[PDB]
Each structure stands twice: as structure tokens, then as C-alpha cells.
Ligand binder design. Structure first.
Ligand SMILES: O=C(N[C@@H](Cc1ccccc1)[C@H](O)CN(CC1CCCCC1)S(=O)(=O)c1ccc2ncsc2c1)c1cccc(O)c1
Lengths: 99, 99
């Protein structure tokens, strides 16, 4: 598909039994999801942006479905105000910027 | 051009005869540049990111050439970690997400 940028590029993603709306975000190195109690091992991390840093939990090899495309990779979980699909997954679903 | 996402989508911009590197950031509503001098009136504004809110200076109708494409729009100046091109100017240069 082609997604214009008049509005926020929000799309439906699925992670287990949760469907969520998430930004397709070319500015995000990593994928950051709102607080959720995912199973398995994780490692603490701090990530920075406008305003400063937040503390997140890094989960590896988590399958995520983004607009029906399959991805699997690292997901950071913490008190972000918006679900963010970062470049680590955007590349996997074939996402480019075009102008 | 078509820009893939295995690397950060950094591009050269021209603003006030100065060249700068900026990130094409679909997750950003606004264009936000690191501290710099720009001519004219500005308005104080506050914006929010992943780590909270910051104070910026809002400049309107500022020309920027992004990777050869002309925009004229709102540019916020403040303590962003990195120069970012947001949706307000991404739309002006005809940028879309594709997969
Ligand atoms: O900060 C914004 N946008 C955010 C997304 C956003 C939207 C709305 C609310 C909060 C955040 C960015 O697109 C992604 N961030 C990465 C940062 C951006 C700042 C400087 C460079 C790198 S980010 O969110 O801070 C971010 C994301 C992934 C990641 N992985 C490793 S470090 C890291 C940082 C934003 C949103 C709306 C208006 C606005 O003026 C700015």
C-alpha cells in the first residue's frame, strides 16, 4: 500500500491476543510498544527522544503482524504514549519512503 | 528518491544557506531543528515526545530544501536530540510510505 502523511500513519498491528494501533515511524530505530505483560525473558533499557529518556523492557524474537505482513524481532515495552513501529520491523514488511 | 530503512533516513537540507543533516521522521507531526538562529518573529510553543515536553521557538513560512525538494512551512527550534523533518514538510515534498 501507499500511506500519505496528511495524518499520523497509524496502522493495526497484532501481538498475540492484542490488536493495537501503531505509528509507522521512520524516525524510530527500534519498536516501542505501550505497557503490556509479554511472556519471556527481557532486559532493561533506556531510550531517548524529545523530552528525555524512558525506561523500557527489551523482548527479543517477538512475532508481530503489521497490516497482514509478518514480522519478528525486538520489541521495547514501556510508558510510551503511542505504539511505535520502528525501522527494525519496517524493513521486514518492505517499507520505504518515496518522493 | 526511494529510501530504504536499514539505515536512518538522514538527508541533507538547506536552510538559510546552511547545510544540515536531518532525519525524515514520519512519527513526528512537526519539523524540529536543534538550536540555531533564524530570522524573524517566533512564538514560544511546547511540544511532547517520548520523554515528555520541551519548549521550542516556532518560526512560520520558513523555506527548506530537503534533498532537492522545496518546502516552505513551520519550523520549530529547540532541544530535540536530532534535527527532524516531520509530516508538515514531508507532505509538502510529496513523501509517502510504501510497502
Ligand atoms: O518525538 C516525536 N516523535 C517520535 C515518536 C513519538 C510520537 C508521539 C509521541 C511520542 C513519540 C519519533 O518519531 C520517534 N522518536 C525518535 C526520536 C525523535 C526525536 C529525535 C530523533 C529520534 S522516539 O519516539 O523518541 C524513539 C522511538 C524509537 C526509538 N528507538 C530507539 S531510541 C528511540 C526513540 C514527535 C511527535 C509529535 C510531534 C513532535 O514534534 C515530535
Amino acid at each position: 500500500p501507499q500511506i500519505t502523511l496528511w495524518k499520523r500513519p497509524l496502522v493495526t498491528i497484532r501481538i498475540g491476543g492484542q490488536l493495537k494501533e501503531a505509528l509507522l515511524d521512520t524516525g524510530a530505530d527500534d519498536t516501542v510498544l505501550e505497557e503490556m505483560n509479554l511472556p519471556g525473558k527481557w532486559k532493561p533499557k533506556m531510550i531517548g527522544g524529545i523530552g528525555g529518556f524512558i525506561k523500557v523492557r527489551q523482548y527479543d524474537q517477538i512475532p508481530i503482524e503489521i497490516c497482514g505482513h509478518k514480522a519478528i524481532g525486538t520489541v521495547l515495552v514501556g510508558p510510551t504514549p503511542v505504539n511505535i513501529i520502528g525501522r527494525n520491523l519496517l524493513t521486514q514488511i518492505g517499507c520505504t519512503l518515496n518522493f
